[PDB]
Design a binder for this molecule. Structure first.
Ligand SMILES: [Cl-]
Ligand SMILES: [Cl-]
Lengths: 129, 129
């Protein structure tokens, strides 16, 4: 629960990061302080820009551009499949990835588009088996 | 790095939550998408409202009030010590708590005011020894 480590006098909390993400997912479930809608083939997904930027290289690049920083709606490539995006948005807020035989190619394609390198790497590992 | 668990078919990522928090702290360091300033005895601290709400019962209560939701400046009780607040803001974004003999009473008092129950519990454990 707590531990100490070398070269650093601070107390380390093992559960804090998971608790923060859990509470951020609760905010999303309740639509509290969400500040962007992502549009994927007419499907709409509400989210927190900071969480998107902390998980996706695409969204990091988008919202660090001064012109795009304050946009409230982001339209993605119409070829992106909404189910794949939904799975990856859930992953962002949960650390849990719904990979199945029937969606892994779409999830991998969407994670490459979003620049989510650890999801892509994981997809390639499962494909190889 | 990855694991499976019962009652849930999804892949579990062990490092994701810590990576999200690390990237959120990077956004804070760069002042990217910060949306509130907390004022503590004339000292000013920039932060992300969603992270404050995910860590502090006080900030959760504040920003779920419709009148206070869009405030850009929050003034805290003038008796709160800025060093204690700084230590707890760092903890929110890092899972690391700078507890010392010389600050533990102030940090505990500030964590009670912010309603950060796991920090308070930890302070009481260290005090008892
Ligand atoms: Cl990733
Ligand atoms: Cl806490």
């Amino acid at each position: 629960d707590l531990y100490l480590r070398p070269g650093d006098s601070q107390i380390q909390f093992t559960r804090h990061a998971s608790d923060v993400l859990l509470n951020l997912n609760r905010l999303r479930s309740r639509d509290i302080l969400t500040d962007v809608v992502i549009v994927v083939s007419r499907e709409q997904f509400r989210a927190h820009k900071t969480v998107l930027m902390a998980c996706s290289g695409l969204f990091y690049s988008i919202f660090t551009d001064q012109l795009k920083r304050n946009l409230s709606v982001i339209n993605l490539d119409p070829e992106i499949n909404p189910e794949g995006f939904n799975i990856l948005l859930d992953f962002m807020y949960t650390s849990r990835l719904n990979l199945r035989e029937g969606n892994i190619m779409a999830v991998m394609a969407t994670a490459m588009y979003l620049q989510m390198e650890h999801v892509v790497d994981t997809c390639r590992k499962f494909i190889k088996a």
